[PDB]
């Protein structure tokens, strides 16, 4: 009522909508992502014919 419904007793249920539309494009990551190699070693050794 004009006074029998205080704000603090009104729940005001929200729409279940979270609004994070942040920068999430990772195309450079997107390229060469599903081919990431998980080594059991910390080093990456490969040869290079330089001459």
């Amino acid at each position: 009522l004009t006074n029998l419904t205080p704000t603090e007793l009104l729940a005001n249920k929200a729409v279940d909508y979270l609004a994070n539309s942040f920068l999430v494009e990772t195309p450079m990551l997107g390229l060469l992502a599903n081919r990431v190699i998980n080594q059991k070693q910390k080093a990456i050794e490969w040869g290079a014919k330089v001459a």
Binding site: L1, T2, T5, L9, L10, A11, N12, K13
Partner: protein, 52 residues
């Protein structure tokens, strides 16, 4: 209440005042004990499924 009056055993057969029954009248008055309020139809709905 009426008066009781005496007469000598064989005396003037008289008349004495009777009780004056009286009519009392009240009225269920033409006035109200009332509570008048207005509720906006929003406040009914804004606080139907939105009340703690």
């Amino acid at each position: 209440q009426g008066v009781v009056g005496g007469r000598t055993r064989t005396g003037a057969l008289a008349n004495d005042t009777q009780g004056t029954i009286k009519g009392a009248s009240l009225s269920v008055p033409d006035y109200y004990i009332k509570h008048q309020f207005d509720v906006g139809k929003d406040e009914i709905v804004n606080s139907d499924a939105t009340g703690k």
